Amino acid sequence: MDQFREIGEVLGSIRALMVFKDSIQINQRQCSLLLDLFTAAYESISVSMRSNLRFKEKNTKWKILEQPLRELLWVVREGEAYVRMSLEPKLGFWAKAIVLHSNRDCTELHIHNLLSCLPIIVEAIETASEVSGWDEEEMSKKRLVHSNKYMKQWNDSQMFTWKFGREYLVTEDFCNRFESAWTEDRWILIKELQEKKQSGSSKHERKMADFLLKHLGDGNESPKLFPSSLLDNTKDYQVKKRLQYKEITWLGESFALRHFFGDIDALLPQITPLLSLSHPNIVYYLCGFTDEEKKECFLVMELMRKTLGMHIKEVCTLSLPVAVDLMLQIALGMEYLHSKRIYHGELNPSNILVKPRSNQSGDGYLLGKIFGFGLNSVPFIWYSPEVLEEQKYSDKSDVYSFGMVSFELLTGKVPFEDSHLQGDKMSRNIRAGERPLFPFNSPKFITNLTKRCWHADPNQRPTFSSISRILRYIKRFLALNPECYSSIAPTVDYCEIETKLLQKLSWESTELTKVSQVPFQMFAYRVVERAKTC
Template sequence: CFTHAGARRWFLIREEREGPARRTGEASKQGRRCRPGASGDRNSPAHHQLLHTDHPPSPSSPSSIQETLHSKGFIFQAFVIPISFAFVVAQEGLVRSFHRFLRRPVQLLLVISIKRRPRKGRYHRLCISVALSLSMEQLRQVGEVLGSLKALMAFQDEIRINKRQCCLLADAFDVAFEAITEEIRQNLNFDERLTKWKALEHPLKELHRVFREGEQYVRQCMEIKDWWAKAISLSQNIDCVQLHLHNLLWCIPVVLESIEAAGEISGCEEDAIYRKRLVYSKKYEKEWMDPKLFQSRFARQYLVSSNLCSRMDSVWKEDWWLLLDMISDKRRSMTKQENRLAELVEGSKGRIFPSSILVASKDYQVRRRLGNGSLCKEVQWMGESFAVRHFFGDIEPLVPEISLLSTLSHPNVMRLLCAFADDEKKECFLVMELMHKSLCEHIKEICGPRRRVPFSLPVAVDIMLQIARGMEYLHSQKICHGNLNPSNILVKTRSSAPDGHLLIKIAGIGLSSVKNSKASTNQTATNPCIWFAPEVLLEQEQTGDSGDSRYTEKADVYSFGMMCFELLTGKVPFEDGHLQGDKMSRNIRAGERPLFPFPSPKYLTNLTKRCWQTDPSQRPNFSSICRMLRYIKRFLLLNPDHSQPDPPVPPVDYYDLETSLSRRFTSWATTEPTPVSQVPFQMFAYRVVEREKTNVNIKDKSSESGSEGASVCGDENTLSSSSTLSDDPCSVPLNSLKPSAQLHSDANKKQPLKKTTANGKANVDSGQKPKGRAVRPPQLTPCGPSLRMNSESQLPPLMESPGRRKSRGHASDSEIA
């Protein structure tokens, strides 16, 4: 079955049988050449015919596929994978791919029905081609979205809201695509796209998601229906820079790094490979770790030119001025209701308007209450859906807090659009963006006996990064949350992300007198002290009142660490513990923390444990957390085998990288939010220091091996399995880039365990798996794809076999406490 991007028709391939006629070699050849849209040679005994149906079989039910094929005259047997091919299938991840394909529609799905086992080799080449051609398909899809965006921008004069931001986004996407395709043309061979481009698959998939979300933003701004509602919700909105361009500038370094990894194994000439590796190593030298030098050298590659950076800083203000001019020009022809809405748009910040503007509107309609016992309702107003927080009480003391909340604007912070009040009835209406549910509710819905962990690692890290970015912005505004927990994190499913990515917004900020009037269902069911820092619990015990506690930024970091535990494990902290009430509070102050299960990744559990340190001074700030999470997200994207029983681990501790870089760049140690234009440089600086520390560990280990009499010409050295992360350079590839290494892992495993030393003697394996390989300086680059090179290669081997890595594992993986 083949599906085409943007098409809703399914092409079903049928093979007709004509009695006992014997298939000729020419007929088989013509049948194999058949492609979607062509029917093949109809004179051959067996040909392939493409049929069309508007009702595709359900991907989740193999029986429905069988019934549909049978009703169309097909001969359906089964999905057959020969045993001789099982090793290759497992190595390339095809089992997981087919498993994923059967559960939702995809761009390319190949269903094979056979009667007998095919000749060895033909099935092998077919499956490998399907698995490895996805990188080119992802690149094509990115270009498809860019073409759609260019078609929209042909009518940019019709954009009436955030026109300058839409133009900036389109220009940035255009420059990014040109830079990426230029790098691909210079570093990769098109003829090798089926065999050596696999490292690009997941980074390009992430880039495709970024492009789709940006295109949807432009579509939303171009929609002319319900213009006043869009003016209220999109004016003073900075999602273009802080959300879409942030994601783009984070993704570009990862895509470029994957191109470099694929480029190291591209081509057949050793001299050309050597030169490319030398060029890549020179790129990540310490001399470029200066923001100005980086901008002058890599401005086009990383989208940090002075023109784009200046536009990022001013584009929001320009759109705001254009909107005010547009409203001013329409003043004379406006109705009375439109004049009220114009005043609402022009002066929404810090003002509280009469409730009659909202309630007396003809199209104002209350839909439903949001949550049990919540003060929020979903309403329909001016053709759009909003969330309204409706409460009663004295409004005058709340005016300063409401004015402060109306000035907040960040993609990951719940935004107050406008406020209405009735002084006589003492009621207040706060209009906000509509979200789907809380993070607590979402986790409860998706978790179950068959799915104990709510999110995959990439999705969990993405959620953690969004929460950290929102808190980074709040702390830069001198606002401490004080009640950070999953009930105050609101989520919305992204329609462009079928892989489970969510849009996160932090709620529950301010209006403490209103919050304390009615407790949420989750807080009554769960002891709220599990989210509070030890110093906050101590103060509550001393004062006897939780409402008067002085919350700090580091207390929010502690709460964030507890939420990370729930995101990674699906368990509420201490839910299976024996401590309740005062005992739990006392033990938390004494240092007790929840325990991670065994398979938890070390690099994420370490970060979580840093956040919930008992000493507040030992906890990182949210700016540092954001930088570390961005780099962890990059690591997961370049190493897609993180869900395997023995997943890859980073070569260094990212907290150590952050500490050393914060000492070098004093601006990193502040709590100010990172400018979006600085994200590529921060990713680059992390990469440079990571390479430096890894190479130092390599040299230290190489010298230790040399002192023990080991050869420096490629002999196998046995390394201790209990060595630490910093002392074991061969536990992972130097660039932490596993996809490029897996392209030929099957060929690597077939090589015999008989090595030839420099003296010409054979080193025969004695039944014990080799643990590592001594290397010789200088190390040109940590992106070494030396899996196709035998011991006679002229290049220094920079990476050990993935099979050898996995056979050994890492000692720190078992250290949970």
């Protein structure tokens, strides 16, 4: 309680907002899905607290539920902000359509956080139930139930969805709605645009509707660039001064504008893949503009200002949960990029734009995105060793970079501060097995990822689809016992678990993990720990 009730009230606030459902023009289906999932998670949590916990012992034996319920509170509070963003009338219909036509914020931010936060709450409730009561027979029986839940024979996605599907909101109906709730509003938007295509008020809107219809999968002709006159024509199109990126504000909502000169027709086949991307942790290109297939191209982005590099030096460090959330978001971005066969050439702290959360959720929490991956064509620290000894954008050459930034987030210091005495001798040193050293205070479980991404052998570095699912499980552990971040470390090394599960479950078959698989993965990790209690 006192966190559970806050979740209930935030959910009620979302329901009150969603009363005016039809006022949402673009996210009606996604907002409805968010409501239908938050309500289901709340129902399951309430039922499991009724069945398991005793209210008489509210103030003493529920201390373990405080932080998982806080994290679920934060997830629901971010869902509420998403609904208010999708429902507010501050921005016009066109400014909203340019931004939210290919959002995917729902299933990748909010649904993903919810489905990675429910296992923590469920497991915490079980652990609180075992110590609940005064009868040792009850405690032993509950321990037996929970030990038979996490036994090894329940290691299969279909086994888990059968036995434990309803508990973790992975059911056939929910799994179907995770995907068919973004195509549904896409179709509705196409219909609403076709109506404005011929019944619009102005000729400029006549062209805007054609622009967006061709921009959204008309004839499956997705990769294309439209005349830049649309930017100029709009009643208001003031291009603000840059501080290659400029602050266009062409629908009244400020956007970042990247414009470059080159033979765009020749550079077309490599920007064609780039315009298709859409991920919450990616600063992707909303629309593309060329004048008349001529000199210049206009690429419009979402506007973010502060980077992680100049944010850390602003506040100086970051707490462990904040660093872990940043790492998880960055890893989720990179696994999406790698799933689409394009690799950030160099990943640096500077190349990570961050923006703080609602600030109603937590203190110091912030969500960050990655940019600059596209158009590789047109110091020596974040480079991988073999690339550093080059006298090429590999999938493993930036996993090293991600681990390098991971060290930076944890210790809060730019790496190789101590080696500053050496001048350019670092380049030869990195070839040798020398890596920056952690402070001893840093917890063992987290820093093992940095040691494993630092590994000299390119093959042994874990993929991003494995780093992400390690990180969200470390977030689970960091949620159960807050005292760890504020020897509290677990027993098993999580990387060892990943190595075991990759061969056992064949998780390497899929480059990217769909959201409906998140609770099963966090469940499989717990099974391997339980089998390794010894």
